[PDB]
Amino acid sequence: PLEVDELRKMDLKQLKERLNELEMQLLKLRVESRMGTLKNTASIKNTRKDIARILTVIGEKSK
Template identity: 50%
Template sequence: MKAAELRKMKLEELKKKADELKMELLKLKFQQKISGLDNPMEVRNLRRDIARVLTVIREKELRGEG
């Protein structure tokens, strides 16, 4: 997920996307504890995607965009 794509989205869409990604991360972590993951890098990449979304949300809030 590219930051440029995220900047085109509206604030409400970004917040919804952040919630979805957090739920997905929770499921992945649970699966990792129970049975392990085929690709443990998924967790790291997902955390970075969440950080990207939250960064863009904060940028929009500071600019006063909605």
């Protein structure tokens, strides 16, 4: 999943938990430190890259 534009579309209140809900499942992927043996290594990069974006898009809304 690569969300790119709808972040700019709608309100900022929801993206807080949208950040949170992503943040939680980041932990879920973070079980790999035990050799989680999770299939999608790129998910972390997918997770890590996108999480910053919404954490960046908020500035465009002059937070």
